[PDB]
Amino acid sequence: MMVISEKVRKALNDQLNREIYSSYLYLSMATYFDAEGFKGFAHWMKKQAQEELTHAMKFYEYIYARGGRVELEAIEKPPSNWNGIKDAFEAALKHEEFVTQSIYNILELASEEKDHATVSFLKWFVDEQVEEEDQVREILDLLEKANGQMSVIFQLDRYLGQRE
Amino acid sequence: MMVISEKVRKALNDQLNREIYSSYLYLSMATYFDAEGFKGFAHWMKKQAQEELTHAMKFYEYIYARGGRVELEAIEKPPSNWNGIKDAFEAALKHEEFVTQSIYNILELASEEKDHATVSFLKWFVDEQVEEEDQVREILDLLEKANGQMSVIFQLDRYLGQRE
Amino acid sequence: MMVISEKVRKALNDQLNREIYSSYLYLSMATYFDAEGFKGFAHWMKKQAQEELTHAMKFYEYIYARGGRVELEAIEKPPSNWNGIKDAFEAALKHEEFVTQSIYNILELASEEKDHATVSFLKWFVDEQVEEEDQVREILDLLEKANGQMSVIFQLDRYLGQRE
Amino acid sequence: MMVISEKVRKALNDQLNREIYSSYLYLSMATYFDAEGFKGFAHWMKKQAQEELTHAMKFYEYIYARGGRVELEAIEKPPSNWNGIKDAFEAALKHEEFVTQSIYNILELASEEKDHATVSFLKWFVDEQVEEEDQVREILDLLEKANGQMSVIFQLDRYLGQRE
Amino acid sequence: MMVISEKVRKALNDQLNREIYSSYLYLSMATYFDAEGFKGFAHWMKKQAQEELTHAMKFYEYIYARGGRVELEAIEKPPSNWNGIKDAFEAALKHEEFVTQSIYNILELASEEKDHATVSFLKWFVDEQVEEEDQVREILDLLEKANGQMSVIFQLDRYLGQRE
Amino acid sequence: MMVISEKVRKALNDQLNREIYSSYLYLSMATYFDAEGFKGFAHWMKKQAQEELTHAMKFYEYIYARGGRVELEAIEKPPSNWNGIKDAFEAALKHEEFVTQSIYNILELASEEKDHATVSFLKWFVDEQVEEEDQVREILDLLEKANGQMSVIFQLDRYLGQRE
Numbered sequence: 002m003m004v005i006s007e008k009v010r011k012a013l014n015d016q017l018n019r020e021i022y023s024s025y026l027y028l029s030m031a032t033y034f035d036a037e038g039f040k041g042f043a044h045w046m047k048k049q050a051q052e053e054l055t056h057a058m059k060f061y062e063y064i065y066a067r068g069g070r071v072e073l074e075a076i077e078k079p080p081s082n083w084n085g086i087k088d089a090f091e092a093a094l095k096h097e098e099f100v101t102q103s104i105y106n107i108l109e110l111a112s113e114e115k116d117h118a119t120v121s122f123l124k125w126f127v128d129e130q131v132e133e134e135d136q137v138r139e140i141l142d143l144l145e146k147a148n149g150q151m152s153v154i155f156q157l158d159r160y161l162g163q164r165e
Numbered sequence: 166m167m168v169i170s171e172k173v174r175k176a177l178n179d180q181l182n183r184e185i186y187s188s189y190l191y192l193s194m195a196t197y198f199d200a201e202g203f204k205g206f207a208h209w210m211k212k213q214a215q216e217e218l219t220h221a222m223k224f225y226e227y228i229y230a231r232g233g234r235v236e237l238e239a240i241e242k243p244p245s246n247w248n249g250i251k252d253a254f255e256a257a258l259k260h261e262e263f264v265t266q267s268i269y270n271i272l273e274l275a276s277e278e279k280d281h282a283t284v285s286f287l288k289w290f291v292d293e294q295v296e297e298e299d300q301v302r303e304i305l306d307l308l309e310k311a312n313g314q315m316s317v318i319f320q321l322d323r324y325l326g327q328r329e
Numbered sequence: 330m331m332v333i334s335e336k337v338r339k340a341l342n343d344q345l346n347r348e349i350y351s352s353y354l355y356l357s358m359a360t361y362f363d364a365e366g367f368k369g370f371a372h373w374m375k376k377q378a379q380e381e382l383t384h385a386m387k388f389y390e391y392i393y394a395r396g397g398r399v400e401l402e403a404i405e406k407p408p409s410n411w412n413g414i415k416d417a418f419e420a421a422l423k424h425e426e427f428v429t430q431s432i433y434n435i436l437e438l439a440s441e442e443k444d445h446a447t448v449s450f451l452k453w454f455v456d457e458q459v460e461e462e463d464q465v466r467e468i469l470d471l472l473e474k475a476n477g478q479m480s481v482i483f484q485l486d487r488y489l490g491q492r493e
Numbered sequence: 494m495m496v497i498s499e500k501v502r503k504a505l506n507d508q509l510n511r512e513i514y515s516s517y518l519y520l521s522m523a524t525y526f527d528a529e530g531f532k533g534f535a536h537w538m539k540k541q542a543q544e545e546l547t548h549a550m551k552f553y554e555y556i557y558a559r560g561g562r563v564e565l566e567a568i569e570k571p572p573s574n575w576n577g578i579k580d581a582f583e584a585a586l587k588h589e590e591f592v593t594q595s596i597y598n599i600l601e602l603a604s605e606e607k608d609h610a611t612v613s614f615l616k617w618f619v620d621e622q623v624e625e626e627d628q629v630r631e632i633l634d635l636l637e638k639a640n641g642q643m644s645v646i647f648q649l650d651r652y653l654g655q656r657e
Numbered sequence: 658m659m660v661i662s663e664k665v666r667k668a669l670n671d672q673l674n675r676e677i678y679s680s681y682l683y684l685s686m687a688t689y690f691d692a693e694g695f696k697g698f699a700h701w702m703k704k705q706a707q708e709e710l711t712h713a714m715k716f717y718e719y720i721y722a723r724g725g726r727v728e729l730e731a732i733e734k735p736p737s738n739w740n741g742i743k744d745a746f747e748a749a750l751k752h753e754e755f756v757t758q759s760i761y762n763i764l765e766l767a768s769e770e771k772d773h774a775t776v777s778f779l780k781w782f783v784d785e786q787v788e789e790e791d792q793v794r795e796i797l798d799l800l801e802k803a804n805g806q807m808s809v810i811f812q813l814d815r816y817l818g819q820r821e
Numbered sequence: 822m823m824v825i826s827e828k829v830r831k832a833l834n835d836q837l838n839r840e841i842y843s844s845y846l847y848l849s850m851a852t853y854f855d856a857e858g859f860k861g862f863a864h865w866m867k868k869q870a871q872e873e874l875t876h877a878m879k880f881y882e883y884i885y886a887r888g889g890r891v892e893l894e895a896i897e898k899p900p901s902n903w904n905g906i907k908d909a910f911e912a913a914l915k916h917e918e919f920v921t922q923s924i925y926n927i928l929e930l931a932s933e934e935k936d937h938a939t940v941s942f943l944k945w946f947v948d949e950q951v952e953e954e955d956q957v958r959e960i961l962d963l964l965e966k967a968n969g970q971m972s973v974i975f976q977l978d979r980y981l982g983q984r985e
């Protein structure tokens with residue numbers, strides 16, 4: 002039987018679906034970059050999309066480990082175009098900060114319910130979000146320095162296209 | 166410039182989104198098998214979901230190679246429950262036969278337009294569909310022979326849980 | 330259930346039986362070459378007979394993959410006497426060209442029915458028949474040049490006897 | 494020149510053709526097992542068909558070694574269906590016992606003619622027939638013990654499917 | 658004797674000669690890049706010329722495999738001057754798209770004649786042309802982004818000069 | 822700036838174009854040998870065609886090293902048929918002797934102009950032409966000894982077909 006509350010189960014399932022959307026949004030940013038011919042930025046976003054799916058499956062396996070079940074929900078259509086390289090990465094940063102706040106909300110729900118197992122499980126994501134946000138902020142700072150000069154933006158398309 | 170027609174680009178983009186849905190459907194079947202305690206069947210379905218993502222990305226890269234762009238659409242909520250193991254695999258077979266017909270329709274459209282590049286590209290998917298349909302039919306035949314015997318269902322769950 | 334039509338299943342089953350006969354014909358050619366004391370030509374024909382069985386089994390496995398069944402039919406007695414070495418290889422070429430036309434007829438039937446899976450499956454055989462015909466044409470050209478000279482025919486016997 | 498009698502040559506050639514039919518019969522049993530969805534039993538029968546061809550070719554090479562020639566005859570249509578797994582293997586046992594008696598008849602004929610070379614050649618087949626018959630009896634014993642339990646028949650299908 | 662029609666043989670021979678011209682055109686592009694001091698772009702074009710010769714020899718061997726013969730025709734003088742790097746690669750792209758259409762025309766002729774062997778042979782070039790066009794489009798996108806900045810064009814010259 | 826005279830540059834460019842024609846001529850001889858069924862002689866001629874391209878590219882790189890430019894000219898249609906194997910190799914010998922005299926004419930022009938760099942560059946070709954002529958003379962001597970004797974011509978075809 003399920004040892005998380007239905008309310009914590011719902012919060013975790015909601016977050017799983019949010020991570021699925023995150024993966025889909027980053028794939029959409031990849032489609033935009035590929036349409037604009039930045040094959041390295043697109044590669045970076047495809048890798049990010051794969052990473053978000055691993056987040057979703059961590060939520061999946063935790064839900065089942067606590068006796069719950071996962072219900073997949075409809076996936077909203079992501080935006081398909083951005084008003085520039087900066088516009089896309091600013092959207093990514095805004096999205097990741099929203100994901101961080103969502104995880105925070107689950108953590109406090111679990112803590113109020115004295116569900117220490119879920120509180121502890123979420124630590125990994127708190128720490129991971131620190132890094133996700135930082136990587137996007139670093140990219141945005143580089144884009145600010147480039148100031149639209151393609152001499153430099155070529156170098157950064159090439160470097161992010163190196164992501165493993 | 167785009168060297169596929171807009172109608173062929175649309176058909177290919179539609180199929181990419183269909184493959185994304187397929188992946189999500191197989192993930193949902195995994196949520197069902199895991200809820201029912203069949204971790205080997207669930208494992209098989211997670212592997213199948215990943216395979217469907219590789220199909221989607223094959224369409225993605227071909228579309229860009231012909232000068233088109235991809236637009237991701239909303240993904241419909243899949244079913245979450247089946248009336249038993251057979252019911253789920255029968256749903257999988259019906260879905261794969263629908264995917265095959267979808268591929269056939271693109272092939273016939275591209276052939277009507279004398280788009281030999283797209284006709285040739287689609288051959289890989291025709292052959293792959295033969296294999297996917299056959300593997301599900303094989304599982305259904307084994308389940309029919311098992312006739313609900315848990316000894317045999319345990320053995321098959323093991324076997325499918327070994328999928329690489 | 331069977332997802333090829335009965336007319337296509339019958340065409341494929343007919344061709345499987347045709348490939349069995351091909352194997353048997355080449356074994357009969359081996360009996361002739363061995364009776365004439367050309368063990369290298371006989372070796373080549375025994376290898377060709379084994380190759381034809383691999384063709385039959387490719388049809389076999391495709392038929393089952395599409396939900397059909399194979400029915401083996403009577404095997405006609407092959408000829409056992411030829412006028413000479415070149416006449417045997419000329420008969421081989423005529424047989425392979427007949428096999429190619431038989432395959433073409435299946436492809437055109439499948440295409441009429443929009444059975445794209447079977448059309449795609451048969452491509453391997455179209456390409457292979459090009460090679461089968463060409464290898465016999467090459468041997469026939471060498472035998473025409475030899476012009477019955479037993480010195481040269483012995484060299485060709487030793488060379489064909491090296492077939493792997 | 495031929496140093497076997499024509500009667501012994503005919504007996505050996507008749508047996509070569511019997512071995513060709515044996516191979517074809519076992520391939521037909523494979524068509525039945527594959528239609529019934531027992532891919533391991535079918536695999537065993539495909540291996541047996543290849544073994545029977547090695548028997549035919551041992552007769553072939555001996556006939557030529559004694560200065561005779563081989564004449565291939567029409568091959569009769571084998572049965573395509575059996576009333577079940579045990580029915581098919583009972584047919585296989587009856588066939589192999591008929592093959593053994595046929596070999597015995599050649600041996601007795603050659604002995605009457607004081608053709609010691611052929612009597613000695615046939616000892617390999619006498620000994621091999623002991624093993625062929627015994628392997629079928631062992632499978633029939635296993636099927637008798639299984640008594641139609643699919644739990645056990647799955648085991649036997651996988652075990653026979655491991656045949657090298 | 659020839660098993661392609663004279664019309665299909667002439668279409669294939671015409672294409673072989675077109676592939677020879679393609680090779681010569683790319684060598685001429687190398688003469689331009691070397692005159693402009695871009696040794697890496699020139700290296701890329703020398704490698705491309707060699708690849709075009711392999712295309713010509715594939716047509717050569719297929720014509721002979723179907724019993725035809727090759728007749729080499731005069732090769733027209735290629736252009737030797739372009740208005741810049743991007744202009745040369747735009748010419749390469751236009752040339753490759755013309756080559757693709759030429760191949761399509763042969764494919765449609767062969768299909769009209771039910772020459773399934775030749776249609777199938779041409780599939781390889783259909784797929785290869787997809788790749789050739791895409792590789793030139795990728796180079797054109799890089800040159801577009803470079804926007805005449807010699808900093809980037811030096812790097813691109815080195816990179817293309819590494820072609821194996 | 823160009824440090825060869827225009828007259829020497831034109832002589833070298835003319836010779837580069839002559840070497841291209843040489844390559845094409847030897848490919849045409851290959852088309853003849855393949856039409857006649859002598860795949861070893863054809864192989865030898867294909868290897869010779871590639872060797873002539875290496876000659877052309879040695880002229881190419883020297884022209885650029887001295888500040889000149891290469892202009893590729895139209896290639897004349899080579900003969901496609903010869904009155905036999907010996908006729909083809911006699912034509913090859915006559916061609917190579919013509920090439921040697923052409924190189925000599927460049928050397929004498931450069932010496933008149935005291936262009937010691939070009940005189941020295943051409944020594945490699947003087948020495949190479951000695952070998953080019955000698956290998957064809959050797960083949961012609963073998964063919965004279967063979968005297969149309971097909972037994973011997975087979976041996977010569979296989980030997981020339983081993984060319985690396």
Ligand SMILES: CCCCCCCCCCCCCCCCCCCC
Nearest residue numbers: 024025047050054188189192211214
């Ligand atoms: C290389 C880009 C990968 C594609 C990312 C797609 C993002 C949206 C996909 C929707 C979800 C589909 C189901 C995926 C389940 C994966 C489960 C296996 C373990 C990761």
Ligand SMILES: CCCCCCCCCCCCCCCCCCCC
Nearest residue numbers: 352353356375378516517520539542
């Ligand atoms: C040493 C060379 C051996 C050549 C043997 C070729 C025999 C050809 C006879 C064909 C007709 C009988 C076919 C029987 C079925 C064989 C199935 C084998 C694959 C499983």
Ligand SMILES: CCCCCCCCCCCCCCCCCCCC
Nearest residue numbers: 680681703706710711844845848870
């Ligand atoms: C770096 C080398 C570049 C050389 C390109 C030359 C293209 C000129 C075309 C002329 C054709 C001559 C015949 C060549 C036949 C070669 C056949 C064998 C090799 C595939």
Ligand SMILES: [Fe+3]
Nearest residue numbers: 020023053056
């Ligand atoms: Fe995430």
Ligand SMILES: [Fe+3]
Nearest residue numbers: 184187217220
């Ligand atoms: Fe798929």
Ligand SMILES: [Fe+3]
Nearest residue numbers: 348351381384
């Ligand atoms: Fe065949």
Ligand SMILES: [Fe+3]
Nearest residue numbers: 512515545548
């Ligand atoms: Fe036997």
Ligand SMILES: [Fe+3]
Nearest residue numbers: 676679709712
């Ligand atoms: Fe090409």
Ligand SMILES: [Fe+3]
Nearest residue numbers: 840843873876
């Ligand atoms: Fe030369």
